[PDB]
């Protein structure tokens, strides 16, 4: 159809969750919260990627939420625009 995920593999929330196997211990956000926001781990530092838009984010900050960082950086993401 008319939209297409940048990474079809990470379409599943479960698969996004498992990508956080080696999420570093200084990274305060939970794999649960990140995966639920469409994000999976790139395997580099604290850098994550959206399956849908392909946007990438790093250097998470105390008080950051995955959804709001996702939305504010990539507002036109179909995953962002499809949630509730």
């Amino acid at each position: 159809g008319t939209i297409y995920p940048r990474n079809p593999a990470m379409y599943s929330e479960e698969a996004r969750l498992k990508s956080f196997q080696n999420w570093p211990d200084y990274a305060h956000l939970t794999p649960r919260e990140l995966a639920s926001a469409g994000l999976y781990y790139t395997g580099i530092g604290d850098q994550v990627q959206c399956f849908a838009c392909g946007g990438k984010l790093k250097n998470w900050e105390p008080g950051d939420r995955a959804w709001s960082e996702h939305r504010r950086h990539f507002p036109n993401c179909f995953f962002v625009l499809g949630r509730n």
Binding site: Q47, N59, W60, D64, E69
Partner: peptide, 4 residues
């Protein structure tokens, strides 16, 4: 967070 910031863009890469």
């Amino acid at each position: 967070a910031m863009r890469v």
